[PDB]
Amino acid sequence: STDYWQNWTDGGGIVNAVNGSGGNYSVNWSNTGNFVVGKGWTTGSPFRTINYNAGVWAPNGNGYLTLYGWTRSPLIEYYVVDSWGTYRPTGTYKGTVKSDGGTYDIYTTTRYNAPSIDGDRTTFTQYWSVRQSKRPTGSNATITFSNHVNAWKSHGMNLGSNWAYQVMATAGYQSSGSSNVTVW
Structure with missing residues (x-):
C-alpha cells in the first residue's frame, strides 16, 4: 500500500x-552525480515495518540500498542502510542496534548548504543505521523501523515531530548500476 514515488537527481549523468x-x-x-529514488509512504511513521524484496541490487561503485526519509521540526534526513556498493557509509559513531536478523552501527553526520526537502541550500543532521555486513538480497526482507527509532532515541538522536516521506530507496553518488525493488 505504498503511495509515494521518490525520484530526485542533481542532474548529473543518467538516472x-x-x-x-x-x-x-x-x-x-550511469556516471551520476547524487540521486535518490524509491517507493514508500507519503507520511513516514516511527511504528511502520517496511517490507521489500530487491530482485536486483547491482551497484557499480558508490550506491546504497536503504530506508530513506525525512522529518521536519527539526529537519532530519535518516537512513537504514541494508546494502551498498564499494563504500560502506559511516560517520560519528553512536552505538549499535540489532534488528531484522542484522546488526547495525549507528552514526550521525552533517550536511552544509546542501539539497534537502526544504530547498537547495540547507544545513541539517543525518541519522544512520548501517548494517555491519551487506544484507542478502533477492528474498523478502523487513526493516522494523521502530527498533531503529528507539535505538537512535537512546543516543539522543530524536526525530522531528512533522513526518515527511519514508521510502525504500536506491541512492547513488558518482556511480552506475541497476536495481529492481518491490516495497510494501
Whole structure:
C-alpha cells in the first residue's frame, strides 16, 4: 500500500527510474552525480515495518540500498542502510542496534548548504543505521523501523515531530548500476 514515488537527481549523468506496478520500481543509472529514488509512504511513521524484496541490487561503485526519509521540526534526513556498493557509509559513531536478523552501527553526520526537502541550500543532521555486513538480497526482507527509532532515541538522536516521506530507496553518488525493488 505504498503511495509515494521518490525520484530526485542533481542532474548529473543518467538516472533512469521506472515507477512500476504497485510497490515495484527499477533504476538504471550511469556516471551520476547524487540521486535518490524509491517507493514508500507519503507520511513516514516511527511504528511502520517496511517490507521489500530487491530482485536486483547491482551497484557499480558508490550506491546504497536503504530506508530513506525525512522529518521536519527539526529537519532530519535518516537512513537504514541494508546494502551498498564499494563504500560502506559511516560517520560519528553512536552505538549499535540489532534488528531484522542484522546488526547495525549507528552514526550521525552533517550536511552544509546542501539539497534537502526544504530547498537547495540547507544545513541539517543525518541519522544512520548501517548494517555491519551487506544484507542478502533477492528474498523478502523487513526493516522494523521502530527498533531503529528507539535505538537512535537512546543516543539522543530524536526525530522531528512533522513526518515527511519514508521510502525504500536506491541512492547513488558518482556511480552506475541497476536495481529492481518491490516495497510494501
